[PDB]
Design a protein around this ligand. Sequence first.
Ligand SMILES: [Xe]
Length: 240
Amino acid sequence: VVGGTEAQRNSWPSQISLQYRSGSSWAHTCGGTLIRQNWVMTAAHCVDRELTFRVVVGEHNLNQNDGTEQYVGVQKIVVHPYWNTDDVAAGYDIALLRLAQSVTLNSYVQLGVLPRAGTILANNSPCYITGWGLTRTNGQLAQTLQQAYLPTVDYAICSSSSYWGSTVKNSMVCAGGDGVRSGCQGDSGGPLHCLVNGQYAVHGVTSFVSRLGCNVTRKPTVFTRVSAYISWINNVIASN
Ligand SMILES: [Xe]
């Protein structure tokens, strides 16, 4: 997250760190949202590589003991069947991870609330991106979970020529684009949390930014629109 602030420890308890085994250690690679005690929602592109993955829930600082973490292996990966790794712009950037164990819920570990199917946010709706991704274009991962306030940019504006044009689909949510704050590498797969009727819900799964950089004016961060995938999500969980 570029232009973020440090999240309070208990603000976003559905945020997870998706990590891969790297020698004798583990490396953060993406975010995710805990949606059942044994299922995480993330981006398909996060799991294209043939790596060994684990999830950390109750994580705040990637590099220090928080006293709240639970570490769990990924048992099964279900990518959206229409995902194509060479065409992120086509959409379908979503995947579900079945965890080897069911995690325990508490003030640091909670299920993310998902929007009702079909819900589209009005232009300029209040949302926060969260993650441990790069804090500058071509920078380094954050140590502590970051948040940034990124208002939505509706499909009409986002798909206009000076924004993303044809690259953005109605199965996506755009947010931000102010040139100061944005998602960045390592935020992929994580939540976009939007306040609706007094409650935050996870409306987006972080998918991409501009090849030119993270915080680029009129290139808002682009997310998979969760409310487009509610039936798919339910179908996977019910058959697995
Ligand atoms: Xe990203």
